[PDB]
Each structure stands twice: as C-alpha cells, then as structure tokens.
Amino acid sequence: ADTKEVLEAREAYFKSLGGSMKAMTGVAKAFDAEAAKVEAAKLEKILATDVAPLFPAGTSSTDLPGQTEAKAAIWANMDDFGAKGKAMHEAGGAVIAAANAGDGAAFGAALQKLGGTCKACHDDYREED
C-alpha cells in the first residue's frame, strides 16, 4: 500500500524482532524457564506477521534514500528473500518449542540457529550505510 505505511509497518516489525532477540539472548545467558516462555509468547505473536506485502517494489534505499535500508537487490531475488524469510519463521518455531519444553540447552541452541537466519538475510539485503 502507501509506502509511508509499508515503511511504517516494516520498521515496527523489525524493532519488534530486534527487541525479542535482545531479550532472549540475555535469558539464554541466564536461563529461567518462565521468562523464556514469556519471551516465546511475544516472539510467536511477531512471527504471525506476513512480511510479503512489506516489500513492494519501489521501497529500496535507492528509491527512498535515508528512509529505509532495504537493498534494491531484494527485488531481483524475491525467491531467495522469501526462503530466508521462511528459514527464519522455522528457527523461531524451534526456539518457541524449546522455551515451552523448559529446555535451557535446547533453547540456547535454537537461539543460535535463529540469529544465524537474521544475519543470512541482512548479509545480502540490508545496507550497512
């Protein structure tokens, strides 16, 4: 839809993820089954979001200089972008499951896998500066 809101929506999605990752990382440092489930409840909500309508063509850093970090490359690799998007949704399910199993070791392992997916996509599609 109107870029102004697509940007608005996608910024909220990532600030949300970023926050969750930061919180789960501290929890993994000092595992507590209860706080992991509260964090897992929040992450589950976030992943219900469809990122598909979030990257309509014409919203890259080259189209909206300084308003987004979305690399125009996304629009030449939408299939790979979707895959990295799906890969993330799956690692997160693993994290949620581990939290709910109360498995501090499983949860720590799943978190690494998840962080790996953030980096994989950012690596090819987000701009440093």
Ligand code: HEM
């Ligand atoms: C993994 C759970 C994951 C996290 C964590 C995450 C964080 C994140 C932040 C906080 C930003 C903010 C911008 C900044 O650099 O300050 C950001 C932005 C983008 N991301 Fe991301 N992100 C995670 C995962 C992924 C995945 C799976 C993808 C690609 C399929 C992805 C892509 C991007 C893109 C593109 C942006 C830029 C969006 C914009 O600036 O408008 N991220 N992410």
